[PDB]
Amino acid sequence: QNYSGALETVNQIIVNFPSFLPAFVKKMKLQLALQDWDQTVETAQRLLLQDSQNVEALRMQALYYVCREGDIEKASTKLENLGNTLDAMEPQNAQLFYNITLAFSRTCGRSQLILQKIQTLLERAFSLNPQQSEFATELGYQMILQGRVKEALKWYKTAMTLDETSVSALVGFIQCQLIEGQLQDADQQLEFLNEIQQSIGKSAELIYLHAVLAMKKNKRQEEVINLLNDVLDTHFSQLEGLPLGIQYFEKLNPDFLLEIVMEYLSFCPMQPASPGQPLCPLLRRCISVLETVVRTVPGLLQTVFLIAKVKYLSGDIEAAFNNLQHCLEHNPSYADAHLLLAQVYLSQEKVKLCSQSLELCLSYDFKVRDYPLYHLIKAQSQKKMGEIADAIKTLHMAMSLPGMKRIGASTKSKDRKTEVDTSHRLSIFLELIDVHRLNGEQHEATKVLQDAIHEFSGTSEEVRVTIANADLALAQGDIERALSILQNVTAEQPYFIEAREKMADIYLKHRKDKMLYITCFREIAERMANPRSFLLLGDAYMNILEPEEAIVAYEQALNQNPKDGTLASKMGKALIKTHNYSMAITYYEAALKTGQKNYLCYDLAELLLKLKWYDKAEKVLQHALAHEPVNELSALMEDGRCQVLLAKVYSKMEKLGDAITALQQARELQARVLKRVQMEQPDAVPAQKHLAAEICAEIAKHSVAQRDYEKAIKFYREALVHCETDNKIMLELARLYLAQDDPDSCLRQCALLLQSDQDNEAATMMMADLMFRKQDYEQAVFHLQQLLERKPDNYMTLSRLIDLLRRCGKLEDVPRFFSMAEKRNSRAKLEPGFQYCKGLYLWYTGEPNDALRHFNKARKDRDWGQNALYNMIEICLNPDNETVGGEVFENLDGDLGNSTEKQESVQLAVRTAEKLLKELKPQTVQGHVQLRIMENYC
Amino acid sequence: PVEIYSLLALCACASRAFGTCSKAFIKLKSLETLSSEQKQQYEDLALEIFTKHTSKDNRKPELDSLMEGGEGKLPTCVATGSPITEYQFWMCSVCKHGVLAQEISHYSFCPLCHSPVG
């Protein structure tokens, strides 16, 4: 295992002997065993550049496009070139064509254009040997994969007449019979093969066709699951000790394993819930199965689409999205990746992006119309958009497909057939009932519900049909029909949790009874104690405003599934709402010590920050960054956000240089994120560019605090080079173009910001100040007047306009804008910003007492009161607004100025302006300096 | 709900019922009509109260013993806004609400409907 020393000695071989092919073929086969498809491609290509007829390197390039890239065009063209080398080298070797066709068919992922090329290679083998049953069996198999079950039947029947002993042909014929619903023939022929099996040894295929027959006969799910467990555990027993050679792909049979996974997924959940639910061991088996197919042939992209789907169904939507992005960068035209991406966006309520990914899925493959799950997801998207009538059409298009109903001979459905998942079949019925219900077609909803009761009878999913009858009963106002159905679900039945939640919800909605709600929820806790039911019980108690029992529920969950960060965060929230901060802190520390998800650093930091323990947050985030930085794309972005967050904390620590170093370390990590995201996750590019913009904006802010306004312009220009149209970045570079005396570039950023959003008040006021500096006072006024005619209640724009009108000498224009605020908002007179704007006006008209009265009504407000206080201090220092110590007038007024009455009342106003200054709490060093100056003016 | 849970949070805070105040703040932040800004402002005030005192009741109201509804409800007196614990008591011939037999003596007209007392 000294791969670095081996690579050095191999480079010495290739330096001494550049032409020596055997080294490269060994290096290529070793690199496939090392899962290194990149260097396996380099060695295959470097070998093909020296031996263009090399069948193994051509086979390895055709396998690369089938087994990492999923690229149908590159796979079909490398299969064409491989076939043309067979025409060049032993064209009569029908066995070599057959061997090639087995490898490529068992790995194809049901691609029609790959299967057409494979079929022509196998048809050439069959024209060379028409007597060969097995060539006809694999034509039978390739016709199942193309959906051509009529041609599959002919190719298996001809394989049987070519060899009556070809059990391979009979297994394939039984698979066609089961797809056709010819169950009685499949049953008898499987019993016949189960007697013959002792002469063959146990085959996972025969157990699988028993599991499929048992599923079609509606046998108990634990029996079908136990048969599939025996299919997997017998199948893997064949593969023991084998090297990762091309023969492993034929023996592993990826195609067969993905069907098995899809019917484990018929028994799995249909929702992206977090771990800790009694179904989850079925998803755990699915992960293990798909991980063997990812060890070997992940470019059968249906594998990594199914890992993304299993990740989604276990609540890891970020891992699902990353695996889908990865699939779409192996092949952008891969329709199933867009189909699950629609389910990702649907779960996020991103209904527009769900519709766009459905339209992309269809644009790349019109044969997506042949799958009921497509029509279900488009109906879900249409229903959420309110396109109810078109959701009726797509659910009827779903029901038109074969296998969506129990049907005999002379079928109305005549398209290519598929093995419909019972949970999809259920969902398409249940959502047609809901879409008719939403359309007011209560009779059609009830008719299709009776059809669903008939369709799913005797299954565990029949209880979901009874809960759907209770849902339709609630829409019909039959609340007691709903309750009696739900009450008829008891401790020994599946779906009792949802039944008792619905009973609880009904009693809280209709009977207004929290105790019937709580007793239904305590029945969930008593009968069906598990981490998800205890999490849901917690959330129920939070809706009931009883967080202590919610915390008991979150404890009853979290002591059973300590891996769930979502539960640990919900636990944290309830503990914060109940002053249990040490438990929240220590649960977040345990989740971070067990390596859980990105946001847990933010949960713990923002908690400690809101508790004012900024130093504890600093040390926590430093400890969360004490590892050697992990090179995974997730971990790079996580550490980048941890560094950004540590810089946000360092801001409150006054550690602004460390904040810059942490932000530059985040910029370094974020560059490594972008240079992979552009190649494997391109849909994340705007968000990751925006995070790079925000990093550069914070570097610029810290450089402003360091008085390096040139670095501030530089790093806000970098923030624009990342994101040219972020409102805060535009406004902040406008502020710096202003602060460094470029009013023209400031006006460019104002004009662009106003073009991007006309209602941006700061851009209008900054532009009006620049018009005022350019002596375009009429424009400065008119743009603030337009902004007040859009937003009459706007004390910033009003107080800016008042000072413009003071500096112009046009105070008479102001009362209009007070009246506009009063007309919009009769309470505007009560607001500290109105009281501040009014206090300013009276100081300019000449009424210092009325100015003081209106400033006083504002004076405690955090903006308007702070600014009012400074103007109260101006009046209390100097109520006559004189030159203090001016000899032209302080030698006059003596008939009042020599009196104790004027002296003592003025000096009381001075000595109490110090108390107004004690009410001016500063928040900056400039605030402390201006405060100290005005205390010294007193 | 904004007016209700604001006034309840205020009276609960002034009462030092900071857990009942926490109930009212959770109810406020849940409201889908609020902006993230308003949700944060209510959270800032809740956390200010919680850090300066606690997020739990230092003194406890007990009226939730009726408001869970399972045991039923005593009639709330229109003179006082508290449940009537009397076995039999005055009721308004117009609106048919109850009043405590001591508290009704304070009035000429029904506190709810302003009809003359009888």
A73: nearest Cα among A102, A44, A114, A41: A114
Q: Which A residues, 560 through 589, put their C-beta within 8 Å of a C-beta on chain B? A: 576-579
Residue with tokens 């000072």: A803
Provide DSSP, A22-88.
Answer: HHHHHHHHHHHHTT-HHHHHHHHHHHHTT-TT-HHHHHHHHHHIIIII--HHHHHHHHHHHHHHHHH
Residue B76 forms beta bridges with which residues?
B83
CA distance A687 to A685: 6
Ranges of H-type helices in A809-847: 815-824, 832-845
Chain B residues within 8 A of A545 when measuring between CB atoms: 23, 26-27
Rounded to a whole number, what is the distance in Å from the CA of B115 to chain A's nearest CA?
31
How many other CB atoms are found less than 10 A from the CB of residue A194? 13
Torsion over CA: A514, A519, A520, A524 (sign): positive
Question: What secondary structure letter does DSSP report for A439?
Answer: T
* 8 A C-beta contact, residue B69 and residue A513: yes
Burial class (CB in 10 A: 0-12, 13-18, 19+), A346: buried
CA atoms of A92 and A246, how far apart (whole Å): 23
Measured in residues, chain B has a length of 118
String of DSSP letters for A627-675: SPPP-SHHHHHHHHHHHHHHHHHHHHTT-HHHHHHHHHHHHHHHHHHHH
- Asked if A283 and A273 touch (Cβ cutoff 8 Å), the reply is no
Distance from CA of B97 to the nearest CA of A (A): 21
Task: Please report, in angstroms and rounded to a whole number, the separation of the first and last CA atoms in chain A.
Answer: 82
The span from the CA of A801 to the CA of A553, in Å, is 57
Cβ–Cβ gap B55/A576 under 8 Å: yes
How far lies A934's CA from each of A82, A204, A852, A911, in Å?
89, 90, 18, 12
User: Is A577's CB within 8 Å of B55's CB?
Assistant: yes
Which residues, 6+ apart, have CB-to-CB distance to A713 below 8 Å?
A: A700, A733, A736, A737, A740
- Which of residues 87 through 106 in chain B touch A, CB cutoff 8 A? none
The answer to whether A938 and A911 have CB atoms below 8 angstroms apart is: yes
Six-digit token string for B29: 């932040």
Q: Which two tokens stand for residue A299?
A: 């470019």
- B98: β partners: B91
A85, A155, A70: which is closest to A121 by C-alpha? A85
Q: How many CB pairs under 8 A join A and B?
A: 39
User: In whole angstroms, how far apart are CA A736 and each of A708, A712, A717, A925?
Assistant: 11, 7, 10, 20
In the numeric block, which tokens belong to residue A259?
């069907």
What is the distance in angstroms between the Cα of A547 and the nearest Cα belonging to chain B? 8
Output the DSSP codes for A538-571: HHHHHHTT-HHHHHHHHHHHHTT-TT-HHHHHHH
d(CA A79, CA A61): 9
B51 vs A511, A519, A611: nearest CB: A611
Give the angle A522-A527-A529 at the CA atoms, nearest 5°: 80
Burial A30-64 (b: 16+ CB within 10 A, else e): bbbeeebbebbbebbebbbeeeeebbebbbbbbbb
DSSP state of B116: B
List chain A residues with CB under 8 Å of B68.
513-515, 518
Resolution in Å, one decimal place: 3.5
Cα A409 to Cα A759: distance, rounded to the nearest angstrom = 67
- For residue B50, list chain A residues with Cβ-Cβ distance below 8 A: 576, 579
The Cα of A508 is separated from the nearest Cα of chain B by a number of Å equal to 10
- Contacts of residues A735-743 at CB distance under 8 Å and 24 or more positions apart, as own/partner, are A735/A766, A736/A700, A736/A704, A736/A709, A736/A712, A737/A713, A738/A766, A738/A770, A739/A709, A740/A709, A740/A710, A740/A713, A743/A770, A743/A773, A743/A774
- Distance CA(A856)–CA(A87), nearest Å, equals 98
**What is the sign, positive or negative, of the torsion defined by CA atoms of A528, A534, A536, A541?**
positive
From A513, A542, A579, residue closest to B54, measured CB to CB:
A579
Bridge partners of residue B17, in order along the sequence: B57
A508, A519, A546, A579, best to mutate vs chain B, most B CBs in 10 Å = A579
Distance CA A261, CA A282 (A): 9
CA distances for A248 relative to A128, A238, A252, A253, A293, angstroms: 27, 10, 6, 8, 10
Q: How was this structure determined?
A: cryo-EM
Closest CA of chain B from A579, distance in Å? 5
Query: Whole-angstrom Cα distance, residue A256 to residue A494?
Result: 30
Tokens matching residue A97: 């064509």
Query: Nearest to residue A613, comparing CAs of A578, A668, A652?
Result: A652
Burial class (CB in 10 A: 0-12, 13-18, 19+), A924: exposed
**Which of A508, A577, A578, A611 to mutate to test binding with chain B, by most B CBs within 10 Å of its CB?**
A577
Query: Which residues from A are below 8 Å from B47, CB to CB?
Result: 610
The Cα–Cα gap between A756 and A769 comes to 20
Local structure of residue A682 (DSSP, 8 states): G
Q: Is A863 helix (H, G, I), strand (E, B) or coil?
A: coil
Please state, as a whole number, how many other Cβ atoms lie within 10 Å of the Cβ of residue A148. Answer: 18
The half-sphere exposure of A180 on its side-chain side, counting CA atoms within 13 A, is: 20
Summary count for chain B: helices (H), strands (E)? 4, 2
Q: Which of B4, B27, B28, B50 is the best substitution to test chain A (most A C-beta atoms within 10 A)?
A: B50
Query: Alpha-carbon distance A589 to A604, whole Å?
Result: 8
Cβ distance of B26 and A518 shorter than 8 Å: no
Breaks in chain B (C to N over 2.5 Å), named by the residue before each, are none
**Backbone φ, ψ for residue B39 (5° rounding):** -55, -45
Those of residues 477-516 in A touching chain B at CB distance below 8 A are 511-516
φ, ψ of residue A701 to 5 degrees: the values are -55, -50
Q: In the structure encoding, which two tokens stand for residue B41, read together?
A: 């402002």
B102 Cβ contact list (under 8 Å, min separation 6): none
Q: What single DSSP character describes residue A684? A: G
- Reduced to 3 states (helix: H, G, I; strand: E, B; else coil), residue A180 is coil
Q: How far is CA A342 from CA A316, A380, B7, in A?
A: 16, 10, 45
User: CA A899 → CA A758, A879, A928, A936, distances in Å?
Assistant: 58, 16, 36, 25
Q: How many angstroms away from the CA of A521 is the closest CA of chain B? A: 14
* Distance in Å, alpha carbon of B48 to nearest chain A alpha carbon: 9
> Terminus-to-terminus CA distance in chain B, angstroms?
34
Of A515, A519, A577, the CB nearest to B26: A577
Q: Which residue has the tokens 């405690």?
A: A860
Select from A516, A519, A578 the Cβ nearest to the Cβ of B55: A578
- Separation between Cα atoms, residue A400 and residue A436, nearest integer Å: 17
d(CA A49, CA A537): 65
| A176: DSSP letter | H
Residue A610 contacts B where some CB pair is shorter than 8 Å: yes
Whether B68 sits inside 8 A of A578 (CB atoms) is: no
Q: Which amino acid is at A288?
A: S
Separation between Cα atoms, residue A353 and residue A534, nearest integer Å: 33
Nearest to B69 among A512, A545, A610 (CB): A512
CB contact under 8 A, B69 and A514: yes
Cα A415 versus chain centre, distance: 35
Contact A709, A737 (CB under 8 A): no
Under DSSP, the state recorded for B117 is P
Per-residue H/E/C for B66-101: HHCCCCCCCCECCCCCCECCCCCCEECCCCCCEECC
A574 contacts in chain B (CB < 8 Å): none
- Taking the CA of residue B72 and the nearest CA in chain A, the distance in Å comes to 9
Minimal Cα distance from B24: which residue of A?
Answer: A545
Q: Which residue of A has its CA nearest to B21?
A: A577
Plot region of A219 (φ>0 → left; ψ -120 to 50 → alpha; else → beta): beta
Identify whether the C-beta of residue A106 lies closer than 8 Å to the C-beta of residue A253.
yes
The first and second tokens of residue A810, run together, are 């046009």
Shortest Cα distance from A576 to chain B (angstroms)?
A: 8
* 3-class secondary structure, B17: strand
- Which secondary-structure segment (H or E) carries A118? helix A112-128
d(CA B74, CA A541): 24
Query: Rounded distance, CA A689 to CA A679, Å?
Result: 15
Instruction: Compare CB distances from B70 to A513, A576, A611 and report the shortest one's residue.
Output: A513
Between CA A331 and CA A319 the distance in angstroms is: 18
- How far apart are the CA of A514 and the nearest CA of chain B, in angstroms? 5
Task: Give the pair of three-digit tokens for residue B97.
Answer: 């609400």
Strand partners, B57: B17
Give the residues across from B116 on adjacent strands: B109
Q: Give A270's DSSP letter.
A: S
Beta-carbon separation of A515 and B55 below 8 A = no
Residues of A in contact with B22 (CB under 8 A): 547, 577-578
- For residues A658 and A674, what is the distance between their CA atoms, to the nearest angstrom? 24
Single-letter amino acid, residue A770: L
User: Number of H helices and number of E strands within chain A?
Assistant: 50, 0
Residue A534 Cα distances to A519, A524, A554, A738, angstroms: 14, 8, 6, 57
Residue A120, number of CB atoms within 10 A of its CB: 15
- CA A709 remoteness from chain centre: 38
Q: Which two tokens stand for residue A818?
A: 């007070």
Are A695 and A670 within 8 A, CB to CB?
A: yes
Amino acid at A353: L
